[PDB]
Design a protein around this ligand. Structure first.
Ligand code: MG
Ligand code: MG
Ligand code: MG
Ligand code: MG
Ligand code: MG
Ligand code: MG
Ligand code: MG
Ligand code: MG
Ligand code: MG
Ligand code: MG
Ligand code: MG
Ligand code: MG
Ligand code: MG
Ligand code: MG
Ligand code: MG
Ligand code: MG
Ligand code: MG
Ligand code: MG
Ligand code: MG
Ligand code: MG
Ligand code: MG
Ligand code: MG
Ligand code: MG
Ligand code: MG
Ligand code: MG
Ligand code: MG
Ligand code: MG
Ligand code: MG
Ligand code: MG
Ligand code: MG
Ligand code: MG
Ligand code: MG
Ligand code: MG
Lengths: 32, 156, 123, 80, 205, 82, 129
RNA sequence: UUAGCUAGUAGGUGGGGUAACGGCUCACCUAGGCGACGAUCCCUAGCUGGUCUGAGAGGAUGACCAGCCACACUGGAACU
RNA sequence: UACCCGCAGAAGAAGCACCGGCUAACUCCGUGCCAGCAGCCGCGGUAAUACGGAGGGUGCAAGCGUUAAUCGGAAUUACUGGGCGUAAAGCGCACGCAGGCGGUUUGUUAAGUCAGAUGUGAAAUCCCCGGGCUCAACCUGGGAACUGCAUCUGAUACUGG
């Protein structure tokens, strides 16, 4: 059970978007 | 005694070796509550400046419209690029039945009574232009009398 | 286009199918939780989204989203589904109703209580 | 004071009978174009005086047969 | 079916004096009339096209003390009727019984007038009319009934009115406490600060 | 038997009768040949509660049309009035 | 090939107006002539002139005012592919009465207003602003 | 992405039948009739006055109320 | 019974949704791509006006939200009222029956067409002016309308024969 659970998606690698980074450009801001 | 609205303000870019360079465009429209209207599309790195520029632009290059009372004389269609625009006079009390940019131009112009529809695009800059065109082309009974060489009562 | 052409073959209305077909033009529909589970939403979101395979009364088999924080729904629990959709989830076109039949109202909620089947707090 | 129609005959092989197309020039409902719409009627005629492609005036009467409830009053422009 | 809560708050929100309190004491002393109500009161966001119209509508509704459905109905009626629409609507609003009473001066406030109407004190052509929303027609005499003539509030209201500006479309007598609705009011005779066109536009929307 | 008779068409408790010529076999409010006036029991002062198209009624009678008892009464009343 | 002469006439007038030509010549027809006359009456052209016996050519003279053209719009309405007929109630108001609509009635071709006055409708030929 | 359908079938003569005309029915005679202006077949559906929506033209609809139709446990049948 | 008259005492009588933008209405605390939200765009990875709680506010109100279902916006099947070189869209190219359209002049006809009339287009419903229930909804008197069909009598510019 341990092994397959690990394989399952909920435990996929997470990466975050950047605010001053390379892939930063926000077309519309969170707030107007 | 110019009464003036800023219709829409919009950010625009230019990309360069460094990166994105922003700017703003404002789209104002000034009117006197009578015949005269003009629209101004201004552009600047900061918003207020842009708006000011737009206003300045508007204030010169104004346009005279013949108005029956507080409304249009007769039905009219103005067009420009995507937006094509129909506007039709109406009874005292109906108000300005119109959408967005188009409404703004009407309001300052001193129409108080129209049914107005914008077919096509509703791209504010274009639609205001269209509206202006429509207003400009629109002629009075007096005007047509002169053209055809008759009395205004004969034209009715 | 040409009037003659139109006379020959008249122009046809774009027949729009419903996105909640199990309902069959019913505003809710009862049915039992075959199974209940958690799923992952499609990018870019992250969650364990709680969702039950429901066999509806009218023969259909659907899966239904269970709103709010926490839920009691087991296998062989009888619930009221309604047309709603979690966008992020492939194939979920129905929300459970909280507080209709076996489903309970969300615990400890005080805003938008109605939407989660919660009674007004006492005083 | 008799309601009557003038149609081109279409076929007369069956005896004591003809069938007569009656062109009516209706406006369309939506499109406002005028179409020629055709009304083929079975028409009773004794003597078999009609030919095919012949212009014939008729009148509505009591039903002669299964299909047949019209009877012709006069012929006009018979042979080519 | 009524607005029961704080009255001056509404006024503050609107930006004006809606006359929601008697007018013995000036509104500026009772509340911060300029500052809109709430924790974010001082802050003044720029109001959208939609917003302004809505605000205007609210103001009018507030003034006469009328809820939305009824207002909508009134608007519809106005539209149906001949001539100008906004003006018609205004006239209709005026025509209401409570409003008329207030104008006459038997109410200090419109709320008071409404209450009076409810509580079986107001006779319209010598028949007790109990409904606030009742339209008063031209040449309809409207009086305090004899049981309600002794009330000290009524006289106070009258006094207050006497300080206030008198309407031209009525004629009212203080001793008899009966007034006559002479003709439906012209637009000019009402306050210019209300913009009925906006309301019309809103309802078209 | 074609009968001139009433037809209940008002609110609850505030009946307003239409007087009509009808084949007897049709229902009270249903199918009728002709409507030949009307009647109000709950009639205020300074308004006509009853009004009958008398010529039409006469014609119907001639044709051989019965008259309901209430309708007869109404007719009588009208005659008295005139 | 050539199927609406009236339409053609109108197009000719329009193009002349566009191009600031003085005169428009075309083949004459009775209906066409009538139309021309109507136009003249309503002050949209300066004059018309028929000329010839075997194949006569109508020659209309276009009217300008302060530079720009007088015939501002000149649409056909009835047209062979879709004819139009109007009853005297339903006769239309072109440019809300400031323009005209040439309409063919049992009492000759005339302007819409005239038709209305007469108390009779007809096949609508063309709008002209 | 249903193209061919139909032998009482289309018409005639004469008998019989109906309250009444009529292939309604029967016997003989002719070989028609319907169909791309969609016959036939399949799926769906009671129709209308109206109702909702719409600036209108339209679109959707046919609870109540009223007009017409059909059905009365399913299939048949006549009697009065 | 409706309705009226008397009695007492603020008495028995306010909720529901929402407050990132579209969209009227903003702050603090908790959480920390979790838990959750969500109509669309999209929020949440430790300063979240977008989750949950509060206070504050906005809109509706004896209701207020959610879902389902229709029209509208959608000129997005475009008759009114769209398109087709490159965005979806010109048969690979002809000939040609059915079909649609048809130069110009006269006469005639009068089918379309237009006008006027007569019959009908059930009542109700819609709309207009009124009347009656304290008002309203509701009921109700008269009109208009029901854009149509049929016939008759005219008109003959246009189309047709
Ligand atoms: Mg942009
Ligand atoms: Mg577009
Ligand atoms: Mg006809
Ligand atoms: Mg209420
Ligand atoms: Mg109005
Ligand atoms: Mg009595
Ligand atoms: Mg026989
Ligand atoms: Mg026999
Ligand atoms: Mg069925
Ligand atoms: Mg529309
Ligand atoms: Mg049975
Ligand atoms: Mg059963
Ligand atoms: Mg049975
Ligand atoms: Mg049986
Ligand atoms: Mg806002
Ligand atoms: Mg929420
Ligand atoms: Mg923290
Ligand atoms: Mg925080
Ligand atoms: Mg953050
Ligand atoms: Mg929250
Ligand atoms: Mg929905
Ligand atoms: Mg559409
Ligand atoms: Mg839609
Ligand atoms: Mg397109
Ligand atoms: Mg392409
Ligand atoms: Mg090619
Ligand atoms: Mg020709
Ligand atoms: Mg031809
Ligand atoms: Mg004719
Ligand atoms: Mg006629
Ligand atoms: Mg009344
Ligand atoms: Mg009717
Ligand atoms: Mg000819």
């Amino acid at each position: 059970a341990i092994e397959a659970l690990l394989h399952d998606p909920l435990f996929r690698q997470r990466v975050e978007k950047n605010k001053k980074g390379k892939g930063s450009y926000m077309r519309k801001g969170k707030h107007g | 005694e110019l009464q003036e609205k800023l219709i829409a303000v919009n950010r625009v870019s230019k990309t360069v070796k460094g990166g994105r360079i922003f700017s703003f465009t404002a789209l104002t429209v000034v009117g006197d509550g009578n015949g005269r209207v003009g629209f101004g599309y201004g552009k600047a790195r900061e918003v207020p400046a842009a708006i000011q520029k737009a206003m300045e632009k508007a204030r010169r290059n104004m346009i005279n419209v013949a108005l029956n009372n507080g409304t249009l004389q007769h039905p009219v269609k103005g067009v420009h690029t995507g937006s094509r625009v129909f506007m039709q006079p109406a009874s005292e009390g109906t108000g300005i039945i119109a959408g967005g940019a188009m409404r703004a131009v009407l309001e300052v112009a001193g129409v108080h009574n129209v049914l107005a529809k914008a077919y096509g695009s509703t791209n504010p800059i274009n639609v205001v232009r269209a509206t202006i065109d429509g207003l400009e082309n629109m002629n009075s009974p007096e005007m047509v009398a002169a053209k055809r060489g008759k009395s205004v009562e004969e034209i009715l | 286009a040409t009037v003659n052409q139109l006379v020959r073959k008249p122009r046809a209305r774009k027949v729009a199918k419903s996105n909640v077909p199990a309902l069959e033009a019913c505003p809710q529909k009862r049915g039992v939780c075959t199974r209940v589970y958690t799923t992952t939403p499609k990018k870019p979101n992250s969650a364990l989204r709680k969702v039950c395979r429901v066999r509806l009364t009218n023969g259909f088999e659907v899966t239904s989203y269970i709103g709010g924080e926490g839920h009691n729904l087991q296998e062989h629990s009888v619930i009221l589904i309604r047309g709603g959709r979690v966008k992020d989830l492939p194939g979920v076109r129905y929300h459970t109703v909280r507080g209709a039949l076996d489903c309970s109202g969300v615990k400890d909620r005080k805003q938008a209580r109605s939407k989660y089947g919660v009674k007004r707090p006492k005083a | 004071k008799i309601r009557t129609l003038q149609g081109r005959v279409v076929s007369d092989k069956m005896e004591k009978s003809i069938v007569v197309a009656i062109e009516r020039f209706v406006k369309h409902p939506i499109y406002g174009k005028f179409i020629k719409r055709t009304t083929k009627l079975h028409v009773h005629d004794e003597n078999n005086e009609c030919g095919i492609g012949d212009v014939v005036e008729i009148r509505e009467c009591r039903p002669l047969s299964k299909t047949k409830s019209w009877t012709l009053v006069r012929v006009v422009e018979k042979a080519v | 079916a009524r607005y029961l809560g704080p009255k001056l708050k509404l006024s503050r929100r609107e930006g004006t004096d809606l006359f929601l309190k008697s007018g013995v004491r000036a509104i500026d002393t009772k509340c911060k009339i300029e500052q809109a109500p709430g924790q974010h009161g001082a802050r003044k966001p720029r109001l959208s096209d939609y917003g302004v119209q809505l605000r205007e509508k609210q103001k009018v509704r507030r003034i006469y003390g009328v809820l939305e459905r009824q207002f909508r109905n009134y608007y519809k009626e106005a539209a149906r009727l001949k001539g100008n629409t906004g003006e018609n609507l205004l006239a209709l609003l005026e025509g209401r019984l409570d409003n008329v009473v207030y104008r006459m001066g038997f109410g200090a406030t419109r709320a008071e007038a409404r209450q009076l109407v409810s509580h079986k004190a107001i006779m319209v052509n010598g028949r007790v009319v109990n409904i606030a929303s009742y339209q008063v027609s031209p040449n309809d005499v409207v009086s305090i009934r004899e049981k309600a003539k002794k009330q000290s509030r009524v006289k106070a209201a009258l006094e207050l009115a006497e300080q206030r500006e008198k309407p031209t479309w009525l004629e009212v007598d203080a001793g008899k406490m009966e007034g006559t609705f002479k003709r439906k009011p012209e637009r000019s005779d009402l306050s210019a600060d209300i913009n009925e066109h906006l309301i019309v536009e809103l309802y078209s929307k | 038997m074609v009968t001139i008779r009433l037809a209940r068409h008002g609110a609850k408790k505030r009946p307003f009768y239409q007087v009509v010529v009808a084949d007897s076999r049709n229902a009270r409010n249903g199918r009728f040949i002709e409507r030949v006036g009307f009647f109000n029991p709950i009639a205020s002062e300074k308004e006509e509660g009853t009004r009958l198209d008398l010529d039409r009624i006469a014609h119907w009678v001639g044709q051989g049309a019965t008259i309901s008892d209430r309708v007869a009464a109404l007719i009588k009343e009208v005659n008295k009035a005139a | 090939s050539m199927q609406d002469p009236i339409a053609d006439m109108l197009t000719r007038i329009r193009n002349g107006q566009a191009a600031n030509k003085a005169a428009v010549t075309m083949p004459s027809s009775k209906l066409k002539v009538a139309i021309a006359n109507v136009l003249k009456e309503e002050g949209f052209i300066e004059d018309f002139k028929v000329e010839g016996d075997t194949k006569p050519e109508l020659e209309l003279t276009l009217k300008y005012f302060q530079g720009k053209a007088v015939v501002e719009s000149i649409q056909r309405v009835s047209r062979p592919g879709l004819r139009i007929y109007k009853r005297k109630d339903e006769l239309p108001k072109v440019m809300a009465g400031l323009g005209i609509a040439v309409v063919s009635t049992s009492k000759g071709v005339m302007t819409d207003r005239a038709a209305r006055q007469a108390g009779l409708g007809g096949e609508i030929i063309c709008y002209v602003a």
